[model samples]
Target: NAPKRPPSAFFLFCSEYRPKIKGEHPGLSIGDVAKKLGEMWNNTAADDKQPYEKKAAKLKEKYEKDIAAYRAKGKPDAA
Candidate 1:
């Protein structure tokens, strides 16, 4: 099976913004980062969010295609 793809739009947002949020709060926990990211996403304007959404769509398409190709390659030997 193929490995995981890059990330969804919201998660991509998290990766891009996490460091900035952490820098502002200092010593923020993973849970806190997730919370802040959710808040940021909720508050973001749709226009501002479009780029990430578009990228996510493209990535999802790629993932679907890759999965189909992988499955077509057939099951592995039982050992």
Candidate 2:
């Protein structure tokens, strides 16, 4: 089996901020919420975004390591 790659930094940001945004903008349609989140992400300061980037980096490293080990075991889809 192959290890799944980590989510993008934007996705991590969305996961963390979605609830707060939802509460603040109650009754927003899903698409509108997504648009708002995109705007927020684009406007976010670098310092605020750094933590999510670091977290994604760590997850990506772990995924790489795990996938390497999985591949070493054999061709992943071999039957």
lDDT of 1 by residue, 1-79 (tens): 6635766677778888889898898877988987888788877786867778788878888887876776767335321
Candidate with best lDDT:
2
Total clashing pairs for each candidate: 0, 0
What's each prediction's TM-score?
Answer: 0.78, 0.72
State the weakest 10-residue window (summed lDDT) of model 1: 70-79
Report RMSD (Å) for each prediction in the order shown: 3.0, 3.0
How many backbone clashes can be found in candidate 1? Answer: 0
Give model 1's TM-score versus the native structure: 0.78
Position 60, candidate 1: lDDT:
84
Clash pairs for candidate 2: none
lDDT, model 1, position 6: 62
Give the top-scoring candidate (TM-score).
1
